[PDB]
Design a protein around this ligand. Structure first.
Ligand code: CL
Ligand code: MG
Ligand code: MG
Lengths: 195, 244, 243, 235, 250, 241, 240, 231, 111
C-alpha cells in the first residue's frame, strides 16, 4: 500500500495510514485500515506488496498474543520491535521474502514513555520521534523537522499531522483517499473518527 | 529383535508413577546437599562438595554452582555430567531470548524451558531421564528476586527457601523454623551455612568442602551482581558466622 | 542359556546357533546337486510330486542369473528366490559399470557377502537355503556351493538337501575314476543317476527330474535347461543304473 | 515382551482379538435396516447425573446420506470419523457424486490393520455405518478393528450385543416399516440397558433418501418411548 | 537392518545406581595403573607399557597421546575405547574451537568436550559407556598448567596430583605425602617414577614405562622458524634413554 | 542374563560377546605365522582341504588387500571375507583421498577402530576373526600389524595365531633371544620363507607337503602369494640341509 | 526413531498404560468446576506439605488458554504444561485461519484429541492428566464446562471434580447442585465451590484457589482474604 | 514355544512358527476350489456368513480382464495382495502393452510374501490364494501360500475340509482336464468338487460364489441367482 | 534449449443430440510442414459408453487418454463395477489436467 506516517509526542504515539486499495486501474476500497493491534499498548501499521502486508501483520499479531497469554504479561514496545526486526531480517534472505515495511507505535507502561520504531522490509530498525515509509518522508520530513518539539501535546501532534497530510494531498500525484489516525497512550489504543 | 533388551524408560507403574523418575530422585538423594535462600535484598546459594581429597585442586574446581547468565545462576544436585548438558542448553536459550527481544530472559521462562526438556525424556524417546535437580537463583525486573527448583520429572516450583540433594527432609525443617519474610542477605548467608553444618554427613564443615554464591543488588546503584565465592572467601565467612 | 533365541549372538562356544538352525531347514529340503565338467557345469534337482494335481514340467526350481550362471538350492524355496533376485541385481550393476559379464568367483562373493550380512544383526533372519551355483567365464568353468553362514568354496562336485550323503558318495567316485575329466554330456547322464540314487532318502513320494547346464562347446557358454530327447536319454540312463 | 503384529497358535492376531474384548465393555448400539430407511440407536450411559447427557455424541453424521454409531473406546472413533468425512467429501470433489456406502466403509476399514512397530495399536471401537445410495439402496455395515466389514439387515454391538442380536433374529423381517424399526430399537435397548430407558439416556437416529441423515430430538424420542409403553401394555 | 536400538542401555536401578557406569568403573579398576602430577612449571603423566607379548613391538602402541601441542592424555582401562576417544578429542579440538577462534582450546574446555562425548555414551540409544578413565594434562595462556581426570560417567575433576587404575588407592596415598605447591618439574618426574615403581611387578625401565610432560615450549620440535610468536609445543614425550637417566638418580 | 547376549558390561566389567568372538577365531583349526626379513615380510598358514570334492585352489585364508598390503585371517571364512572386502575398499579410498598408498599400520588401526565400534554399539556383532596385516612399508620397512575382535592392535617383530599359537610363539621368542635382533638376517625372501616353514615344523612337530601350506610374501611395492610348485621348491631346499 | 508400542491391549481388553495414567490423576491435587447461571467457577486444591513456597512465582493451577477460556487440571504437573502450550498455540492458530476465537467445545475437542493421539502412537506414553476446560463462547452468555481424560474422551458437565478425593466432592455436588435452579449469582457459585473443597481440603487458609470466569472475557482470580471470608461464613452457619 | 515370538526366529529344528501360525489361519477359513481345462479356468468358493441377518463374505476378487483369485483366511490381507496384483498387472499393460503372465504373477506374490518372513517388526500374510488366468500359454491355476510357496496346478482346494475336494479332483484329473470349449460342464465339475468338503450345510443361492476365465471369456464373477443354475 | 512441447495439428468436433452424441476428428498427424501419418486414430472408446479425444500435442494427449482409461479401470475395482457417468468422468479429468497446472498437458480435450 501507499502512505504510513508516525509521530511520537510527549505522552502518546500517533499513527496515520492511508485508506486506499488499488488493483489494476481501479480503487477497490477507500476505507481500508492498514494496522493491527499487537497488544493493548502496542500498534503496528504496515505498507508494502499486495497480500504480504496483512499476512505478515497477522502472523506477528498471533505471535505477540501467544506470548501475552503464555506469560500473562505485555512485552515492551522495544521487545516487540526487536522481534519484528528479526523476522524481517530472517525473511530477506528467504526463497521469497515478505515485502513489508512497518511502523510500531507503543506506550511503555514501565518507563511511562511513548515509543515509535520504524522498520523496513530488509530488517532496518530505527527509533524515531517521527517516521515514514516510501516516498511519504520526502514531502513530510521538512515540516516535521521545522515544527516538531518533544513536549508537544496530543492535540498539537494531530495539528502537525494534518499539515503533513495537506502537503501530501497537494504535492503527491497519487490519491490515497485520506488517512485513518490512531492514538497510542497510557490508556491504550483509540481511533480518531473525524479527520 | 531389539525389543528383548528394551527397559522401557517412559512408562507408568500400576500406581501411576514414573519408575525412572522415581529412581532418578533416589540417586539425587545421595548427592551433596544444596541450599537456596531468598531474601528481600538478595539470594544465597550454598552447596556441599562430596567427600573431597586433599589433592583436589579446589580454586579451579566447579561441581555445584554454575552461571547461566549475568542475572541467573544454578546449584546442582545429582550427576554433574548430566547437569552440564542441560546447563549449556540453558545458556543458549538465554542468549536466543536476548538476541530476539533485546532484553535479558525472565527467570521463569528459562526455568520452564529446561523443565520442559526434562519432561520430554519422561514421555517419549525411550531414553533415561537426566539424574539432576536444580536450584535456580535469579533476578529480573518483573518479579525481582526468585528461587526455583526443577527435578527429573520436569516439574518446577517457586520457593522462599529450599534444599535439594541429601537430607532435604531435615534441612527443610530447619529452614522452615528460622526463616522470616523480612530477612536480609547477611542473615540468609548465616542460615544457609548453619543448616548445612547440622545436616552434613561429614564430621565438620570446612571451607574446602563448600561452594558458595550470592546474587545481590549490593552493586553500585540499580543493578545486580553475581558473586561466586573463592576458597579464601568461604573460609572468611565461616569464621565470621562462627562455625570454624 | 538363551544364546539360540537371537541371531548374531555368539554362544560361549563361539557359535551362532540361529545359523545352525537355518542349516536344519536346508537338510529338510529336497536334494540338489552340481557337477563340474571339462568345459562347463551341470545342475540337477529333485522335485517331489506331492500330488497328481501338480502340472508336470511347470514348477521350475532351477533359476538363471544373467545369461551364463545357473542357480539351484535346497531348503526354503522363497529364501532361495530372494537370494537369486539379489544375485541378478548384483550381476546387472557389475555389467552396467564394467561392461563384461560378472565372473563366477566375483558373483560368488556378491552372494556370500549378502548372506553373511544376514548373520550380523538380530533384526534379520539367516537364509534357510544352501545354494549350488556356477557357470562359464573368461577363465573357464566354476562350480560353487553357499551355506546359510555365508561360507562358500569352489567344488569339483557339490550336493545338498536330505539326500546329500548319498549324493556326495557318488560324486567322490566320479572324481576318483575320472582324473583327466568328465565331458558335459556325460555329466548330464551322471547327474540324472545321482538324483535317482539320492531319491532313496525321499522314497515315499515319487519325483520329477530337472537338469540344466552351461558348457563352452554344448551351449556356447550360456545357461540352458536340458529338454526333450536329451532329458529322456538321461532319465533312461538313470533308470537303467538303479535296476 | 512380544510383537504387536504377532499371530497366536490358532491363527489370530492377539491385539485384534484383545481389542474385541474392549468393544464388549462398551455401551450398546443397535442398527436396523428397512426398505423405508435405516435406524440407528445407542445407549448413552452417563457415569454421573451431573454429566450433561446431550454432550454424549455416540451417533455421528459422515455425509448427508451416511450416518454412524459407535461402541467401545469412543475416543478412538474420532480419527476414523474424520477420515470417513474426508473420504466422503473428497470423492464428491473428484467424481461430482455421492460415494457408495460400501466404498466408504472399505475406506474406513483400510485404516484398521495399519498398526505395527503407522499407529501403535488397533482401534478399540466398532462402528455401525448406515446409509443409502442409488445402486444398492438402504444399507447397514458393521466395521471392526480387524479390517473386516459385514453387511447386516440388523445388528447390535456393545455389552448387551449377543442378547440383543438373538432378539433381532426373531423380530426382523423384510417388510418392516420405519416406525416399526424405531420402536424395535427402543424395545431392545430398554431390555439390555442397566438403567431405565428414557429420552435423556438413549438416542435415536435414521437415514432416509428424502431427508438424509437425522439425529432425533429428545422430544421426538420421548413420544416414541410413550408409544412403545402403550403398545406393550395393549396385550 | 537399521540400528533398531534407539533406547537407552544404561538405566537407573531401584537403588538409584546407573549399573553400566558402575561396571565401566570396575573395568577401569582392572586396568593398568596410570598417574599424573602437577608442578609449578609443568605437568607430568605416566603409565606402564604392559606388553601383551615380547614379540610385540611396544613402541608402536602409544598409551600417552598428544591431543594438542599443549595438551596430552593417558588412560586406565580398555585401550581400544581410549584410542577412539583420542581420535574424537583431536578432531573436536579443531571443529568446535580451532576452526572458529584460530587457536587451540584451553585444557578445561577440551576436557569438557571429551566429557560430553563420554556422557552421551551413557544416555544415547544402543550404546554402552566408554570403559576408560582419562587423565588429561595441559597448559594454556590464561589458566596456566592444569591436570584433569575424566570418568566413564562424563564427570571431570581438576587434580594437583592423582592416580587411576590397578593400584590407585595406594598410589594416591603415596602422592599425598610427597606433593607440595613448590615442586619443580624434575621433582614431579622423580616422584612419578617412585610412585609408579610400586605398582609395577616385572621390568622397570625406559622400554616398559611411558612418560610425557607438559612444560616449556620446544622450538626445536616446531618444524619451522621465522614467526616469533610461534615458539613450539609444550607437550613432550620422554625417550627411553631420558627415562633411564633419571632411574640412576632414583 | 542379557549382558552376555549383547555388548554391554557385565558386573565384572567384561564384554562376554567379545570374549566369545575370540573363541570363534579358532573354529577353523588353522595356525598362521608371520616373520620379517631384511627386505621382506613373510606370512605362512596351514592349509586343510578335508573334502575331496572341494576345489583346493579356492580354499584360502590369505588375501591381497592392495598391491603392497597382504592379510591373513584366523577365523570363519564369511567374517574373513567381510573384513577382506572392507579392507580393500578402505585401502582404495585412502589412496584416492590422500594421494598415497595406505600404510599397513594405518589400515590395521582403521580396521581396529571398526572392530571397537562393534564392541560398543549393540546392534552390530563383533567379527569372529583375527586379522594379520603384512607389508614392506615405504617409511617403516617390513611390517606386521595384527587386529582382534576387542579392537586391539599392535606391531610385531614376528607373530603367530591359532589353536597352537603359544607353541609357535615360544619357538620364535627363543630364536630372537639368541640372535638379539628384531628380524631374520637374510637377503632373499626365499630363505625367509624357508625359515618360517622350518620353525613352524619344529614348533608344531608336523611335516608338510606342498598342499599342506599356504604362503604370502611382501616385498617393496608388491605383495604376492606362492603357488604349490613354488612351495615345493621351498620344501626341497629345507630337506636337502 | 523410538517406535515402541507402549500403550497396547491386554487379554481382558484393557489398555493398562491409559489406566495407570488415570492413577496419576487420582494422585494429583483436587480440582473442581461449577457453572452458575451467568458464570463458571474453577476451584483448585493446594497441598500444604509445601510451605516456604513463593506463591507469587509458583505456577498457578488455573491457566488461561485464551482471553475467554481457562484450563485447570489434576495429575502430573509437567505433562499439563505440554497440553496447555499446544492448546494456546491452537487457539491463536484458529483465530489466524478462521477469524474467530475457538469455542470452548472446539478447544476441548483439540486437547482431547492430543491426549488420544498419545494412546495409539509409537514410542510415547499417555498424558497422566485430566483437565477441566471452562469459558464462554464469543458473543454467547451460556456457560461452558468440559472435562477431558488420558484416554481422550471428553464431555460437558453442569458441575464436576477431578483429582484426589474427587469421589467425595462429587458426592457433595450430586446432592447440593440443582439443575432446575443453578447458582444464580457469582457469590452463590463461589460459595458452593468453596463448600465442596472444604469437604476434602483440610485447612481453608492458602490451600484453596478460586478463579471466576464471566462472559465477554471477564476472568479474575480471587485473593486469600476474599476466599477466607467465604470460609468464615460457611463454618459459622455450620455451627447450628 | 520360545521360538514363536516373531518371524525372525528359527526353531531348533529349522521351523518358522509365525509362518506356520499364519498357515493355520487358512485352515480356519472357508473352503474354496480351483480347477482348469486347456481352454478355461474356474474358481468355486463357499462363502461364509456371521449370522442369518448378515451378508455372506465375498471370497473372489478380480485382478485384471484375464486374471483373478479366490481367498481363504484374513480377508484384509487378500485385499492388500490382490491390490498389489492389480498394480502389477496394470504396470505390465501401461509400460509394455503386455498382459501379465500368470506364472510371473505368482513369482511376484512369492517375493512379496517372503520379505515379510525374514524381517523384524512385520508379520507374514494370514491368507491363502487360488489364482486363475488365461494368458499367451493358455489357461492356468496357481496356489499361493503365505510362506511364499507358489505352485502351478491342474486343480486344488484350500480352507477348512479342503482335503475332500482335493481327493475328488485327484480322481477326476483325467476327466475335467479334457472339458474344452464347455464352460458350464467345467463349473459343474468344480461345484461337484467343492461339495465333497461340505458337512451339515449345503449350497444355497447366496452361499455359492463362482468365477471363470477362458479363451474368449473375460474374468467374470457369478453370485446370487446367477449361480442358481448350478445348484 | 530443449522445448518439451510440440504441435501435431489435427482438429476435433463434438455435437450432442437429444438421445445421442458424436465425437469426430481427422486422422492426420503432422510436425511443421511434414505429414507423419495419414491415419493415426485420435478419438477413443474409453469404456462405459464414453468417447474421448485430446487434441494438440499428441504425446500429452496419448498420456491423458491412457490415464483416464486407467482411471475408469480403477473406478470399477474400487466401487463394485459401477458405471462411470459422463459428469463424473468430466470432473475426474479436471483433476488429471490440474495435476499439471505448472507443466500442462498441451491439449484441448473433449468427451
Ligand atoms: Cl577410524
Ligand atoms: Mg527504515
Ligand atoms: Mg554389539
Amino acid at each position: 500500500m501507499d502512505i504510513i506516517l508516525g509521530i511520537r509526542v510527549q505522552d502518546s504515539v500517533i499513527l496515520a495510514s492511508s485508506k486506499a486499495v488499488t488493483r489494476g486501474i481501479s480503487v477497490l476500497k477507500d476505507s481500508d485500515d492498514k494496522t493491527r493491534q499487537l497488544s493493548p499498548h502496542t500498534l503496528m501499521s504496515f505498507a508494502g506488496e499486495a497480500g504480504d502486508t496483512v499476512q505478515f501483520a497477522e502472523y506477528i499479531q498471533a505471535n505477540i498474543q501467544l506470548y501475552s497469554i503464555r506469560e500473562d504479561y505485555e512485552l515492551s514496545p522495544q521487545a516487540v520491535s526487536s522481534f519484528v526486526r528479526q523476522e524481517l531480517a530472517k525473511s530477506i534472505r528467504s526463497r521469497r521474502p515478505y515485502q513489508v515495511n512497518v511502523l510500531i507505535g507503543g506506550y511503555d507502561k514501565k518507563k511511562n514513555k511513548p515509543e515509535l520504531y520504524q522498520i523496513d522490509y530488509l530488517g532496518t530498525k530505527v527509533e524515531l520521534p517521527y517516521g515514514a515509509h516510501g516516498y511519504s518522508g520526502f514531502y513530510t520530513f521538512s515540516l516535521l523537522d521545522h515544527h516538531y518539539r518533544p513536549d508537544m501535546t496530543t492535540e498539537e501532534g494531530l495539528d502537525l499531522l494534518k499539515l503533513c497530510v495537506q502537503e501530501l494531498e497537494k504535492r503527491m500525484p497519487m490519491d490515497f483517499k485520506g488517512v485513518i489516525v490512531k492514538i497510542v497512550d497510557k490508556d491504550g489504543i483509540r481511533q480518531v473518527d473525524d479527520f | 529383535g531389539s525389543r528383548r533388551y528394551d527397559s522401557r524408560t517412559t512408562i507408568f507403574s500400576p500406581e501411576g508413577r514414573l519408575y525412572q523418575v522415581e529412581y532418578a530422585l533416589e540417586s539425587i538423594s545421595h548427592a551433596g546437599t544444596a541450599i537456596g535462600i531468598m531474601a528481600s535484598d538478595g539470594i544465597v546459594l550454598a552447596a556441599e562438595r562430596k567427600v573431597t581429597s586433599t589433592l583436589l585442586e579446589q580454586d579451579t574446581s566447579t561441581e555445584k554452582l554454575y552461571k547461566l547468565n549475568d542475572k541467573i545462576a544454578v546449584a546442582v544436585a545429582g550427576l554433574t555430567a548430566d547437569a552440564e548438558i542441560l546447563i549449556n542448553t540453558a545458556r543458549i536459550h538465554a542468549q536466543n531470548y536476548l538476541k530476539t527481544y533485546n532484553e535479558d530472559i525472565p527467570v521463569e521462562i528459562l526455568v520452564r524451558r529446561l523443565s520442559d526438556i526434562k519432561q520430554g525424556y519422561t514421555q517419549h524417546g525411550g531414553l533415561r531421564p537426566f539424574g539432576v535437580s536444580f536450584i535456580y537463583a535469579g533476578y529480573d525486573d518483573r518479579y525481582g528476586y526468585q528461587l526455583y527448583t526443577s527435578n527429573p520429572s520436569g516439574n518446577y516450583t517457586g520457593w522462599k527457601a529450599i534444599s535439594v540433594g541429601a537430607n532435604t527432609s531435615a534441612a527443610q525443617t530447619l529452614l522452615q523454623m528460622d526463616y522470616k519474610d523480612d530477612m536480609k542477605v547477611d542473615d540468609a548467608i548465616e542460615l544457609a551455612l548453619k543448616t548445612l553444618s547440622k545436616t552434613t554427613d561429614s564430621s565438620a564443615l570446612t571451607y574446602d568442602r563448600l561452594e558458595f554464591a550470592t546474587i545481590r543488588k549490593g552493586a553500585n546503584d540499580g543493578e545486580v551482581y553475581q558473586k561466586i565465592f573463592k576458597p579464601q572467601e568461604i573460609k572468611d565467612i565461616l569464621v565470621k558466622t562462627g562455625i570454624t | 542359556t538363551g544364546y539360540d533365541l537371537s541371531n548374531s549372538v555368539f554362544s560361549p562356544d563361539g557359535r551362532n546357533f540361529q545359523v545352525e538352525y537355518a542349516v536344519k531347514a536346508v537338510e529338510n529340503g529336497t536334494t540338489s546337486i552340481g557337477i563340474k565338467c571339462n568345459d562347463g557345469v551341470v545342475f540337477a534337482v529333485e522335485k517331489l510330486i506331492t500330488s497328481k494335481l501338480l502340472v508336470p514340467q511347470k514348477n521350475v526350481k532351477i533359476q538363471v542369473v544373467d545369461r551364463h550362471i545357473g542357480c539351484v538350492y535346497s531348503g526354503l524355496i522363497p529364501d532361495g528366490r530372494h537370494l537369486v533376485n539379489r544375485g541378478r541385481e548384483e550381476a546387472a550393476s557389475f555389467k552396467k559399470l564394467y561392461k563384461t559379464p560378472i565372473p563366477i568367483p566375483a558373483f560368488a562373493d556378491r552372494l556370500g557377502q549378502y548372506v553373511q550380512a544376514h548373520t550380523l544383526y538380530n533384526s534379520v533372519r539367516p537364509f534357510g537355503v544352501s545354494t549350488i551355483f556356477g557357470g562359464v567365464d573368461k577363465n573357464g568353468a566354476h562350480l560353487y556351493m553357499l551355506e546359510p553362514s555365508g561360507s562358500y568354496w569352489g567344488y569339483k562336485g557339490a550336493a545338498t538337501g536330505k539326500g546329500r550323503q548319498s549324493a556326495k558318495a557318488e560324486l567322490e567316485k566320479l572324481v576318483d575314476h575320472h582324473p583327466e575329466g568328465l565331458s558335459a554330456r556325460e555329466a548330464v547322464k551322471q547327474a540324472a543317476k545321482i538324483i535317482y540314487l539320492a531319491h532313496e532318502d525321499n522314497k515315499e513320494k515319487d519325483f520329477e527330474l530337472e537338469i540344466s547346464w552351461c558348457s563352452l562347446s554344448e551351449t556356447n557358454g550360456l545357461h540352458k535347461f536340458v529338454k526333450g530327447d536329451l532329458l529322456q536319454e538321461a532319465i533312461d540312463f538313470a533308470q537303467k543304473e538303479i535296476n | 515382551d512380544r510383537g504387536v503384529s504377532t499371530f497366536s497358535p490358532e491363527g489370530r492376531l492377539f491385539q485384534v482379538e484383545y481389542s474385541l474384548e474392549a468393544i464388549k465393555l462398551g455401551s450398546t448400539a443397535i442398527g436396523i435396516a428397512t426398505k423405508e430407511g435405516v435406524v440407528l440407536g445407542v445407549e448413552k450411559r452417563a457415569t454421573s447425573p451431573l454429566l450433561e447427557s446431550d454432550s454424549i455424541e455416540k451417533i455421528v453424521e459422515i455425509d448427508r446420506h451416511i450416518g454412524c454409531a459407535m461402541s467401545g473406546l469412543t475416543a478412538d472413533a474420532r480419527s476414523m470419523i474424520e477420515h470417513a468425512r474426508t473420504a466422503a467429501v473428497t470423492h464428491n470433489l473428484y467424481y461430482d457424486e455421492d460415494i457408495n456406502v460400501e466404498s466408504l466403509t472399505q475406506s474406513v476399514c483400510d485404516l484398521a490393520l495399519r498398526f505395527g512397530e503407522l499407529m501403535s495399536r488397533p482401534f478399540g471401537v466398532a462402528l455401525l455405518i448406515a446409509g443409502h445410495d442409488a445402486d444398492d439402496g438402504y444399507q447397514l455395515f458393521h466395521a471392526e478393528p480387524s479390517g473386516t466389514f459385514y453387511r447386516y439387515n440388523a445388528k447390535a454391538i456393545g455389552s448387551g450385543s449377543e442378547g440383543a442380536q438373538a432378539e433381532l433374529l426373531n423380530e426382523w423381517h423384510s417388510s418392516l416399516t420405519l416406525k416399526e424399526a424405531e420402536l424395535l430399537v427402543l424395545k431392545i435397548l430398554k431390555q439390555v440397558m442397566e438403567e431405565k430407558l428414557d429420552e435423556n439416556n438413549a438416542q435415536l437416529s435414521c437415514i432416509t433418501k428424502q431427508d438424509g441423515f437425522k439425529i432425533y430430538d429428545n422430544e421426538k424420542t420421548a413420544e416414541l418411548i410413550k408409544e412403545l409403553k402403550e403398545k406393550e401394555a395393549a396385550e | 537392518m537399521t540400528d533398531r536400538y534407539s533406547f537407552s542401555l544404561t538405566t537407573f536401578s531401584p537403588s538409584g545406581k546407573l549399573g553400566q557406569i558402575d561396571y565401566a568403573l570396575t573395568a577401569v579398576k582392572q586396568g593398568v595403573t596410570s598417574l599424573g602430577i602437577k608442578a609449578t612449571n609443568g605437568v607430568v603423566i605416566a603409565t606402564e607399557k604392559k606388553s601383551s607379548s615380547p614379540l610385540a613391538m611396544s613402541e608402536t602402541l602409544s598409551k600417552v597421546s598428544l591431543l594438542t601441542p599443549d595438551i596430552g592424555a593417558v588412560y586406565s582401562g580398555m585401550g581400544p575405547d581410549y584410542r577412539v576417544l583420542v581420535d574424537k578429542s583431536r578432531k573436536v579440538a579443531h571443529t568446535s574451537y580451532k576452526r572458529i577462534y584460530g587457536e587451540y582450546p584451553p585444557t578445561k574446555l577440551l576436557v569438557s568436550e571429551v566429557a560430553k562425548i563420554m556422557q552421551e555414551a551413557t544416555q544415547s540409544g544402543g550404546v554402552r559407556p566408554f570403559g576408560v578413565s582419562l587423565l588429561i594434562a595441559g597448559h594454556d595462556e590464561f589458566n596456566g598448567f592444569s591436570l584433569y581426570q575424566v570418568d566413564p560417567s562424563g564427570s571431570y575433576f581438576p587434580w594437583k596430583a592423582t592416580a587411576i587404575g590397578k593400584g590407585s588407592v595406594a598410589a594416591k596415598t603415596f602422592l599425598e605425602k610427597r606433593w607440595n605447591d613448590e615442586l619443580e618439574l624434575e621433582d614431579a618426574i622423580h616422584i612419578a617414577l617412585l610412585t609408579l615403581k610400586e605398582s609395577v611387578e616385572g621390568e622397570f625401565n625406559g622400554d616398559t614405562i611411558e612418560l610425557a610432560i607438559i612444560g616449556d615450549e620446544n622450538p626445536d620440535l616446531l618444524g619451522y622458524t621465522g614467526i616469533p610468536t610461534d615458539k613450539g609445543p609444550r607437550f613432550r614425550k620422554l625417550t627411553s634413554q631420558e627415562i633411564n637417566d633419571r632411574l640412576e638418580a632414583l | 542374563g542379557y549382558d552376555r547376549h549383547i555388548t554391554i558390561f557385565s558386573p565384572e566389567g567384561r564384554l562376554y560377546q567379545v570374549e566369545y568372538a575370540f573363541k570363534a577365531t579358532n573354529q577353523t583349526n588353522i595356525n598362521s605365522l608371520a616373520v620379517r626379513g631384511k627386505d621382506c615380510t613373510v606370512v605362512i598358514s596351514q592349509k586343510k582341504v578335508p573334502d575331496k570334492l572341494l576345489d583346493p585352489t579356492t580354499v584360502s585364508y590369505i588375501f591381497c588387500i592392495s598391491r603392497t598390503i597382504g592379510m591373513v585371517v584366523n577365523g570363519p571364512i564369511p567374517d574373513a571375507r567381510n573384513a577382506a572386502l572392507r579392507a580393500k575398499a578402505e585401502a582404495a579410498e585412502f589412496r584416492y583421498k590422500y594421494g598415497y598408498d595406505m600404510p599397513c599400520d594405518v589400515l590395521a588401526k582403521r580396521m581396529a577402530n571398526l572392530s571397537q565400534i562393534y564392541t560398543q554399539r549393540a546392534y552390530m556383532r563383533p567379527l569372529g576373526v583375527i586379522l594379520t596385516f603384512v607389508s614392506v612399508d615405504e617409511e617403516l620397512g617390513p611390517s606386521i600389524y595384527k587386529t582382534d575382535p576387542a579392537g586391539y592392535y599392535v606391531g610385531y617383530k614376528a607373530t603367530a595365531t591359532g589353536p597352537k599359537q603359544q607353541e609357535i610363539t615360544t619357538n620364535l621368542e627363543n630364536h630372537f633371544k639368541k640372535s638379539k635382533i628384531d628380524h631374520i638376517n637374510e637377503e632373499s625372501w626365499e630363505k625367509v620363507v624357508e625359515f618360517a616353514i622350518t620353525h613352524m615344523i619344529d614348533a608344531l612337530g608336523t611335516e608338510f607337503s606342498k598342499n599342506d601350506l599356504e604362503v604370502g610374501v611382501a616385498t617393496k611395492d608388491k605383495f604376492f602369494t606362492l603357488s604349490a610348485e613354488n612351495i615345493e621348491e621351498r620344501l626341497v631346499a629345507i630337506a636337502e640341509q | 526413531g523410538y517406535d515402541r508400542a507402549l500403550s497396547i491391549f491386554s487379554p481382558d481388553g484393557h489398555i493398562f498404560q491409559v489406566e495407570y495414567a488415570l492413577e496419576a490423576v487420582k494422585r494429583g491435587t483436587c480440582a473442581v468446576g461449577v457453572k452458575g447461571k451467568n458464570c463458571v467457577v474453577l476451584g483448585c486444591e493446594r497441598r500444604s506439605t509445601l510451605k516456604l513456597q513463593d506463591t507469587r512465582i509458583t505456577p498457578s493451577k488455573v491457566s488461561k488458554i485464551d482471553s475467554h477460556v481457562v484450563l485447570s487440571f489434576s495429575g502430573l504437573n509437567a505433562d499439563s504444561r505440554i497440553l496447555i502450550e499446544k492448546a494456546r498455540v491452537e487457539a491463536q492458530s484458529h483465530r489466524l485461519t478462521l477469524e474467530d476465537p475457538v469455542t470452548v467445545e472446539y478447544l476441548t475437542r483439540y486437547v482431547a484429541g492430543v491426549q488420544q493421539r498419545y494412546t495409539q502412537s509409537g514410542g510415547v506414553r499417555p498424558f497422566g492428566v485430566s483437565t477441566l476446560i471452562a469459558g464462554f463462547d464469543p458473543r454467547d452468555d451460556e456457560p461452558k464446562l468440559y472435562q477431558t481424560e488420558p484416554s481422550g474422551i471428553y464431555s460437558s458437565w453442569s458441575a464436576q471434580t477431578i483429582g484426589r478425593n474427587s469421589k467425595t466432592v462429587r458426592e457433595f455436588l450430586e446432592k447440593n447442585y440443582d439443575r432446575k435452579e443453578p447458582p444464580a449469582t457469582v457469590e452463590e457459585c463461589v460459595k458452593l465451590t468453596v463448600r465442596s473443597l472444604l469437604e476434602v481440603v483440610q485447612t481453608g487458609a492458602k490451600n484453596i484457589e478460586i478463579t471466576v470466569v464471566k462472559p465477554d472475557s471477564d476472568i479474575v482470580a480471587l485473593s486469600s482474604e476474599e476466599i477466607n471470608q467465604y470460609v468464615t461464613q460457611i463454618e459459622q452457619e455450620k455451627q447450628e | 514355544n520360545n521360538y514363536d515370538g516373531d518371524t525372525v526366529t528359527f526353531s531348533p529344528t529349522g521351523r518358522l512358527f509365525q509362518v506356520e501360525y499364519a498357515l493355520e489361519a487358512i485352515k480356519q477359513g472357508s473352503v474354496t476350489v480351483g480347477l482348469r481345462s486347456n481352454t478355461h479356468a474356474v474358481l468355486v468358493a463357499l462363502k461364509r456368513n456371521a449370522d442369518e441377518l448378515s451378508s455372506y463374505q465375498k471370497k473372489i476378487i478380480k485382478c485384471d480382464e484375464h486374471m483373478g483369485l479366490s481367498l481363504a483366511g484374513l480377508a484384509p490381507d487378500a485385499r492388500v495382495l490382490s491390490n498389489y496384483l492389480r498394480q502389477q498387472c496394470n504396470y505390465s499393460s501401461l509400460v509394455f502393452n503386455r498382459k501379465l503372465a500368470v506364472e510371473r504373477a505368482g513369482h511376484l506374490l512369492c517375493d512379496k510374501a517372503q520379505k515379510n518372513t525374514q524381517s523384524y517388526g512385520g508379520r507374514p500374510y494370514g491368507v491363502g490364494l487360488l489364482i486363475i488366468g488365461y494368458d499367451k500359454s493358455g489357461a492356468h491355476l496357481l496356489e499361493f501360500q503365505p510362506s511364499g510357496n507358489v505352485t502351478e496346478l491342474y486343480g486344488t482346494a484350500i480352507g477348512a475340509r479342503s482335503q475332500g475336494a482335493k481327493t475328488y479332483l485327484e480322481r477326476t484329473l483325467d476327466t475335467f482336464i479334457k472339458i474344452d470349449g464347455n464352460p458350464d460342464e467345467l463349473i459343474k465339475a468344480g461345484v461337484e468338487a467343492i461339495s465333497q468338503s461340505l458337512r451339515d450345510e449345503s449350497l444355497t443361492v447366496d452361499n455359492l460364489s463362482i468365477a471363470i476365465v477362458g479363451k474368449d471369456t473375460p474374468f467374470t464373477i457369478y453370485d446370487g441367482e446367477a449361480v442358481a443354475k448350478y445348484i | 534449449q530443449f522445448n518439451p512441447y510440440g504441435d501435431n495439428g489435427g482438429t476435433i468436433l463434438g455435437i450432442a443430440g437429444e438421445d445421442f452424441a458424436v465425437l469426430a476428428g481427422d486422422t492426420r498427424n503432422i510436425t511443421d510442414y511434414s505429414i507423419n501419418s495419414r491415419y493415426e486414430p485420435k478419438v477413443f472408446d474409453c469404456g462405459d459408453n464414453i468417447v474421448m479425444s485430446a487434441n494438440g500435442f499428441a504425446a500429452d494427449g496419448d498420456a491423458l487418454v491412457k490415464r483416464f482409461k486407467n482411471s475408469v479401470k480403477w473406478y470399477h475395482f474400487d466401487h463394485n463395477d459401477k458405471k462411470l457417468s459422463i459428469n463424473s468422468a468430466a470432473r475426474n479429468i479436471q483433476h488429471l489436467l490440474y495435476s499439471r497446472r505448472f507443466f500442462p498437458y498441451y491439449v484441448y480435450n473433449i468427451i
